[PDB]
């Protein structure tokens, strides 16, 4: 089919090991979050659970195609075939993607080379609580993510205009807590491997 | 041989088949007929606001590419070929760590009718959210949802 030949042409000669613009400029990843539910806050283990739809948008010049079709609205099959950012959550004690019935991932490629990659995630993130004012205590629990291997010179993250979306906030599993609000931050963190762009969401 | 004809039929069916594209792409909307047989309604976890349910989850759909003509109208085939064809990416919106049973083999079945009608069943244990009113507890009653749909494909 037309889409079949388009996909074969795009994958022909493609090297998923190399990020786009390997020696030109950093790859810019626009990140977006939808929070289905912030699970219970486990004060014993200094952690809380959060379920999200996590979306990342970037540009790959190799995936440009010229056709009457303006977008290839694909499924999880080519996620392992194209280059994907190695985004990881820094403060996660335990995290897992969703695999029932199929891997909960979505891939869309536009004719100009824009790739949108979304996936469902459930993350247990550590939140160091200061319980001096317990039970009249308030906390600002973070959720930080960055690129594991690519420093700031290779990958840079940006928050979209609609960065973090929430649904029915007060219908979540926060039995002992009330959600007041959230905010978004970006920072550069120095490590032995290099300097990395860490993006944080505080609840 | 009796089985070589079916081997050739399967090879010709999968030859040139692209499982990255849904049936009827650019021609129509892929209609999936679904039914759920609950083999056991699992216990309700009040602490987790959650309940377990064991289901045979059946989905059926048309695929013109998989039409064939042969000695039998229906090919009851091994589930391993289901990975080699397009199947809907159904997921549970309110699910929480469901498990696809794989003892001894993957508990799935795939059947292809001569007219290209596919039937595809899975065995699952779904753990789903059930928000609760505990103000009338223990005189309380709930309506636990089970919501599912495609992840990648819009209406």
């Amino acid at each position, epitope marked *: 089919g037309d889409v079949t030949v388009i996909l074969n042409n795009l994958l022909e000669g493609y090297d998923n090991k190399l990020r786009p613009d390997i020696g030109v400029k950093p790859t810019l990843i626009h990140t977006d979050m939808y929070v289905n539910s912030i699970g219970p806050v486990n004060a014993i283990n200094m952690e809380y659970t959060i379920d999200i739809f996590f979306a990342q948008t970037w540009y790959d010049r190799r995936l440009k195609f010229n056709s009457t079709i303006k977008v290839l609205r694909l499924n999880s099959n080519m996620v392992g075939k194209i280059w994907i950012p190695d985004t990881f959550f820094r403060n996660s004690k335990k995290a897992d993607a969703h695999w029932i019935t199929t891997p909960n991932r979505m891939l869309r490629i536009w004719n100009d080379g824009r790739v949108l990659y979304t996936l469902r995630l459930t993350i247990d993130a550590e939140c160091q609580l200061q319980l001096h004012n317990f039970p009249m205590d308030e906390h600002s629990c973070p959720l930080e993510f960055s690129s594991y291997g690519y420093p700031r010179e290779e990958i840079v993250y940006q928050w979209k205009r609609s960065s973090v979306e929430v*649904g*029915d*906030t*007060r*219908s979540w599993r926060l039995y002992q807590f009330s959600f007041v609000g959230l905010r978004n931050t970006t920072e550069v963190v120095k490590t032995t491997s290099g300097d990395y762009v860490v993006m944080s969401v505080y609840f | 041989d009796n089985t070589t004809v079916f081997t050739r039929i399967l090879d010709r069916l999968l030859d040139g088949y692209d499982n990255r594209l849904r049936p009827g792409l650019g021609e129509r909307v892929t209609e999936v007929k679904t039914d759920i047989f609950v083999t056991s309604f699992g216990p309700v976890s009040d602490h987790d606001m959650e309940y377990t349910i064991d289901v045979f989850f059946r989905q059926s759909w048309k695929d013109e590419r998989l039409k064939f003509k042969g000695p039998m109208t229906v090919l009851r085939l091994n589930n391993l070929m289901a990975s080699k064809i397009w199947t809907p990416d159904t997921f549970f*919106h*309110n699910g929480k760590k469901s498990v696809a049973h794989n003892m001894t083999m993957p508990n799935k079945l795939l059947r292809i009718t001569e007219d290209g009608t596919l039937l595809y069943t899975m065995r699952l244990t779904v753990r789903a959210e059930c*928000p*609760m*009113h505990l*103000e009338d507890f223990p005189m309380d*009653a*709930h*309506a636990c*949802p089970l*919501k599912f749909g495609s992840y990648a494909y819009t209406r």
Partner: nanobody, 108 residues
């Protein structure tokens, strides 16, 4: 023409309710029109499918109904309901809260 009917609520820690709209034409019969879930899932009646669209502002604790393609047969009094859907989500008996109601009339 086009119209928008809003319905606001307050005075409860209770949230986990479907919020829905019902219609009374002259004749004393309740007709389900639309409903919206806590999962932002929208259910619509067959008669008014694709015409009326329901939405919910959860922070403001309100439900809005945008009405389009109105016709003379749509003249009626519209009621806003909120409640947990037990044995229901399409029957009026499952909603334990109702409003005053608002009239709408179409003149050709």
């Amino acid at each position: 023409g086009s119209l928008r009917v809003s319905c606001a609520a307050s005075g409860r820690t209770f949230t986990t309710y479907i919020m829905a709209w019902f219609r009374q034409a002259p004749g004393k019969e309740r007709e389900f029109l639309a409903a919206m879930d806590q999962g932002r899932i929208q259910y619509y009646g067959d008669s008014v499918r694709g015409r009326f669209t329901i939405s919910r502002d959860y922070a403001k604790n309100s439900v809005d109904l945008q009405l389009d393609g109105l016709r003379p047969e749509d003249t009626a009094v519209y009621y806003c309901a909120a409640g947990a859907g037990f044995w229901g989500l399409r029957t009026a008996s499952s909603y334990h809260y109702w409003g005053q109601g608002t009239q709408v009339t179409v003149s050709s």
